């Protein structure tokens, strides 16, 4: 029971967007040159994410070294000031966060060509400065951009998106208010394909609605890919022209 107009009869949402509109998507490449080999600053809505890619480089411990592939590590730092209400405890060892880090690794292990960087380590540090729904999808886009900036070989883009289901109405790119009022589905689409790297459903969804929700997400993720690709070629032209 929501007293707010999540989806008005006029087809308008609480923030003004319609059912199939992405939030403000602004990417940024090479933001921390003196701190990492690759870096990206993501702004997807009110979401603010710093992503740092450090590597490929020498492992700090020879015990943890693979002679056939690079070691891929991801650490997500959800800051205590990411939400409106400051969290008292840290999230560093939170099981929810360990799953997120693990999830991201399992995604890019099959995209990043780790086999061509044996005996090395790729460390991915992430700092979430502000959070407002669809943080998982934004995490995916931040890593993909930062990895490309580092000149690390990969097969294709991986675009992330979230889709809510308000009763029967699908809502592309959900914010915090919408996620609190409905079940959402997080997608990780590879390139322009229909293949999903990540399918994440944490709340109840009718089996009949799931296929349609996936269809909306994939279409939306393709637009995220285009925006990422667009901003990347723009930065490429501004650098290659000097």
């Amino acid at each position: 029971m929501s007293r707010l107009e999540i989806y008005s009869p006029e087809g308008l949402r609480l923030d003004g967007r319609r059912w199939n509109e992405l939030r403000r998507f602004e990417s940024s490449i090479n933001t921390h040159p003196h701190a990492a080999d690759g870096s990206s600053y993501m702004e997807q809505g009110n979401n603010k994410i710093i992503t740092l890619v450090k590597g490929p480089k020498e492992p700090r411990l020879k015990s943890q070294m693979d002679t056939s592939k690079a070691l891929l590590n991801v650490s997500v730092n959800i800051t205590k000031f990411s939400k409106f209400e400051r969290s008292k405890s840290s999230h560093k060892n939170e099981r929810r966060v360990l799953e997120i880090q693990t999830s991201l690794v399992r995604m890019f292990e099959k995209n990043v060509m780790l086999n061509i960087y044996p005996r090395t380590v790729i460390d991915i540090e992430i700092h979430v400065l502000e959070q407002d729904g669809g943080i998982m999808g934004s995490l995916i886009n931040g890593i993909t951009l930062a990895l490309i900036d580092a000149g690390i070989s990969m097969f294709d883009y991986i675009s992330g998106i979230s889709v809510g289901l308000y009763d029967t109405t699908p809502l592309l790119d959900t914010n915090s208010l919408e996620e609190n009022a409905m079940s959402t589905v997080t997608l990780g689409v590879v390139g322009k394909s229909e293949k999903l790297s990540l399918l994440l459903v944490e709340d109840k969804i009718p089996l009949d609605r799931l296929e349609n929700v996936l269809a909306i997400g994939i279409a939306g993720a393709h637009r995220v890919r285009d925006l990422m690709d667009e901003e990347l070629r723009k930065h490429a032209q501004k650098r290659v022209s000097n």
Binding site: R3, D15, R18
Partner: protein
């Protein structure tokens, strides 16, 4: 700042502070500025070119008429844009069919109304949603439109920005509708907008106040009475601030609860507080502080010296609270308090009549009058009117605006004219809406959910037909029982048939009994407006006059109705039981049937008894009755109750107009036939749905009656008739009630039954997760579990049970709304309230018509004394089913010589037409002269009785 995006879309930052529980949180949301916001006008030729479809691929409809209400220049044709205040104050006038036809409601207004008053916001949205050819309301999202969106200027209050926002919308609409010669009128009571438009600094905007606008309409005199508005010896104290009471509740200083004000005493109220055992009394008129009965009020405990015998700091107030709890346990002195805040008013549209005392016939101008509300527990209201002579002897609908600390009586305004008092039209309409019964016809959105076929809908001949299966893939699960001999036994004028029965004798000696219930679920689907209205009404009310249906006529009295000679969908329950009516097995299945014949209760009984007709159908009907006797036998032996209250049936003269005859409905054996199989159906379904959904099963329980309820009845029985009711068990209560019979008068047993029915606990609906299994017990039926299932057309509870049974058998997955413990709690609390309102309205309908039969007639009827007091007696007339009060003054002569013995419930007095001391005990059959007279104060047709 403001960012421009690729789609021509913009985005800014909406930041506000949310104060909650003394906390301060900075809330920030992004605010998108569009460019494709439709004006929603029929005249517009630009907007439809820029409009986009929604989620369900449906473009929004332009509803604002191309030729609105034309008014004297320079207004001409015009649209109306509303302010926040004029909506909150005159929502009744905004629903009036005779004004406000094309209205534009800004988003900022809709938002402010939602925050200030949610119920008004709902009513405003309903006006927008239910737009027809008479009334048209829209919502222009001005905050989302880049053309109309304004931002707070440096050093500007939020109230002035919002007023400027509304004014900007009017300015935009005006310029946008210039080529169509349609002006815009801003209806606002705020002096800021009127002054800003009067000066005409920037753009030309037609601004009118509410009263000033009404005076420009053709029917100004007909709608001026709907405009919301020394008169004291003392003055009520001001209410505490919201911030104060919020801190008071949090610091255990103030307490909130619902206040009760009795019609016997308007100077004393009592609040039910959780921290206190016994209700806190509120003595005085200043202490009640303009509170109504049923209002949620916040009270402050008065000093101990101000308490009734039948501080500075917060610390002392909490100590006073503890001393109050102690005093309530001692039962010597009882704590008092005073209301200091009204949380939630119980105000609504009330029905009443003008008091002839406060209206001057000589006056021609506007005058103040009083209206006497039909609620005897409620005060009277002041009304501003000019048609005081035209509303003199009529039932009127009024709504309370406010109750100033100065004014002695609350202020309100006129709404509708129901009609002349004691008329079938006005009295029935007043009767319904006083018990909160929606009688208005179903909206267009509701009727659109009905099948596209209409009345020519038909069940498919073949249940495997490609076309039929393509449309209905669940049709393969549908069983075929059209070979069975189904018949329906319902009252004469019954068109809405819910149940249908049949019976066959299986080759193994056992019987096959099938109860078939209307398949309403197949037509009403969760989420639709049809289902929404169905849940809202909860149940259809039954009056002698009319019949307010829960579902549309097309659905309830045709399609879903198990009419004879036609193929109908049904939810069937088939048993296999022996000759001793013992269930061997039971199966639930959705099926398609065809009723052989729709019998009447009298028609069915005659066909069973005549012994001339021995066809297969009649042979099954007798088999049903035979099994009905067995089932009723076992049930009573199990401890089933046999209460009674056979109310009278108003036999309206079908040769004239007004009702003339009052008869009594007789229970035939066919009534026991249907009853027994309906109970059997409900029981089996209850067991099945609870087994499938143990936590959200729509059930119905009946609490065991407390000893205190029967201690008074047993007191009168053991004293006068020297008898008693066991109360040890339901069977014990039934057996002792059964032997409670007087040989000199057969009706004595009926009188005790109809009187012991009044002291039974109310049965209520609930969900299986709210209580434990032993609490599922139904005392009056002596069953471990029970529900309602057999009447989905007239009960929404059965609709829920149907959907749950369908999921139980695996026909179709149960909707999420019937598996949410929270949603189920709301459904149960609603249908429980609608159920009570249904029976009360039903009994009130009987009361009016019977009261009209005895209007101008006097007859010596048979009466029975049910209540004996020192102020008089109360006698019941079984012939008319009306209880009457005989006051001591009209009971006998010399009231000082009469004596009342409470121990024996005896009232001795000397009759007016005699001089012999007569002792009138209780339960006595006495001769009583009936007479009806409308009270000049309450305007209620009461039955004055004079004993003989």
């Amino acid at each position: 700042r403001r960012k421009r995006l690729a789609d021509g879309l913009s985005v800014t930052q909406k930041v506000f502070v949310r104060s909650r529980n003394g906390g301060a949180t900075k809330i920030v949301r992004e605010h998108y500025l569009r460019s494709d916001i439709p004006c929603l006008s029929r005249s517009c030729t630009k907007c439809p070119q820029i409009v986009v479809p929604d989620a369900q691929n449906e473009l929004p409809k332009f509803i604002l008429s191309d030729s609105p209400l034309e008014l004297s220049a320079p207004i001409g044709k015009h649209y109306v844009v509303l302010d926040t205040n004029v909506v909150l104050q005159a929502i009744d006038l905004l629903e009036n069919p005779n004004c406000f036809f094309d209205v534009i409601v800004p988003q900022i207004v809709l938002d402010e109304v939602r925050n200030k008053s949610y119920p008004v916001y709902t009513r405003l949205r309903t006006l927008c949603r239910d737009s027809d050819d008479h009334k048209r309301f829209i919502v222009f999202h001005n905050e989302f439109s880049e053309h109309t969106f304004v931002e707070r200027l440096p050093n500007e209050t939020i109230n002035d920005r919002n007023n400027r926002a509304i004014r900007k919308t009017c300015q935009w609409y005006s310029e946008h509708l210039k080529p169509y010669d349609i002006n815009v009128v801003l209806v606002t009571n705020d002096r800021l907008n009127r002054e800003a438009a009067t000066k005409e600094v920037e753009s030309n905007i037609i601004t009118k106040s509410l009263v000033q606008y009404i005076e420009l309409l053709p029917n100004a005199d007909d709608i001026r009475d709907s405009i919301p508005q020394t008169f004291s010896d003392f003055t009520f104290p001001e209410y505490y601030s919201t911030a104060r009471v919020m801190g008071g509740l949090k610091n255990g200083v103030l307490y909130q609860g619902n206040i009760q004000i009795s019609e016997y005493n308007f100077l004393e109220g009592s609040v039910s507080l959780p921290r206190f055992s016994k209700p806190v009394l509120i003595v005085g008129q200043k202490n009640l502080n303009r509170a109504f009965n049923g209002d949620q009020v916040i009270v402050e405990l008065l000093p101990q010296s101000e308490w009734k015998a039948p501080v500075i700091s917060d610390k002392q107030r909490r100590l006073l609270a503890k001393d109050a709890m102690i005093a309530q346990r001692s039962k010597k002195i009882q704590p008092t308090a005073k209301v200091v805040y009204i949380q939630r008013r119980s105000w609504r549209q009330y029905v009443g009549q003008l008091a002839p005392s406060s209206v001057d016939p000589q006056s021609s101008s506007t005058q103040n009058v009083f209206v006497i509300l039909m609620d005897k527990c409620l005060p009277k209201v002041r009304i501003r009117t000019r048609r005081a002579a035209e509303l003199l002897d009529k039932r009127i609908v009024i709504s309370i605006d406010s109750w100033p600390t100065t004014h002695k009586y609350p202020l309100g305004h006129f709404v509708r004219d129901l009609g002349t008092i004691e008329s079938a039209q006005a009295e029935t309409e007043a009767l319904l809406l006083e018990h909160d019964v929606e009688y208005r016809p179903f909206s267009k959105k509701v009727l659109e959910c009905l099948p596209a076929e209409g009345h020519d809908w038909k069940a498919p001949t073949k249940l495997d037909d490609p076309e039929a299966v393509s449309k209905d893939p669940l049709l393969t699960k549908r069983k075929d029982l059209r070979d069975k001999l189904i018949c329906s036994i319902d009252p004469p004028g019954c068109v809405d048939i819910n149940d249908a029965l049949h019976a066959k004798k299986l080759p193994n000696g056992n019987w096959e009994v099938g109860v078939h219930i209307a398949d309403v679920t197949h037509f009403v689907k969760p989420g639709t407006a049809l289902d929404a209205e169905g849940a809202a009404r909860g149940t259809s009310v039954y009056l002698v006059d009319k019949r307010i249906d829960m579902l549309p006529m097309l659905l309830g009295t045709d399609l879903c109705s198990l009419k004879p000679y036609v193929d109908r969908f049904a939810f069937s329950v088939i048993w296999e039981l022996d000759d001793s009516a013992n269930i061997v097995n039971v199966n639930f299945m959705k099926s398609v049937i065809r009723s052989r014949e729709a019998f009447s209760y009298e028609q069915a009984q005659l066909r069973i008894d005549d012994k001339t007709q021995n066809d297969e159908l009649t042979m099954g009907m007798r088999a049903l009755l035979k099994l009905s006797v067995k089932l009723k036998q076992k049930r009573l032996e199990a401890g089933a109750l046999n209460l009674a209250s056979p109310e009278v049936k108003v036999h309206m003269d079908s040769e004239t107009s007004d009702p003339n005859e009052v008869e009594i409905k007789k229970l035939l054996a066919t009534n026991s036939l249907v009853e027994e199989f309906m109970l059997l159906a409900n029981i089996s379904v209850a067991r099945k749905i609870y087994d499938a959904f143990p936590q959200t099963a729509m059930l119905r329980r009946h609490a065991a009656p407390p000893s205190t309820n029967f201690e008074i009845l047993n007191e009168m029985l053991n004293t006068r008739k020297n008898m008693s009711i066991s109360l040890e068990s339901s069977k014990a209560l039934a057996d002792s009630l059964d032997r409670c019979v007087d040989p000199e008068d057969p009706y004595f047993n009926t009188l005790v039954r109809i009187m012991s029915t009044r002291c039974m606990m109310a049965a209520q609906y609930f969900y299986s997760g709210a209580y434990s299994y032993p609490d599922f017990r139904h005392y009056g039926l002596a069953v471990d579990i029970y529900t309602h299932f057999t009447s989905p057309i007239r009960r929404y509870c059965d609709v829920v049970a149907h959907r749950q049974l369908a999921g139980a058998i695996g026909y179709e997955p149960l909707s999420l709304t019937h598996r949410d413990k929270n949603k189920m709690d709301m459904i149960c609390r609603n249908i429980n309230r609608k159920h009570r309102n249904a029976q009360f309205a039903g009994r009130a309908s009987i009361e009016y018509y019977v009261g009209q039969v005895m209007r101008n007639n006097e007859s010596t009827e048979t009466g029975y004394v049910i209540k004996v007091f020192n102020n008089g007696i109360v006698v019941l007339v079984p012939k008319f089913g009306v209880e009457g009060l005989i006051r001591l003054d009209n009971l006998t002569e010399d009231p000082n010589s009469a004596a009342f013995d409470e121990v024996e419930y005896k009232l001795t007095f000397v009759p007016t037409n005699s001089d012999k001391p007569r002792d009138v005990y209780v339960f006595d059959k006495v001769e009583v002269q009936v007479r009806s007279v409308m009270d000049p104060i309450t305007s209620k047709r009461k039955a004055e009785l004079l004993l003989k």
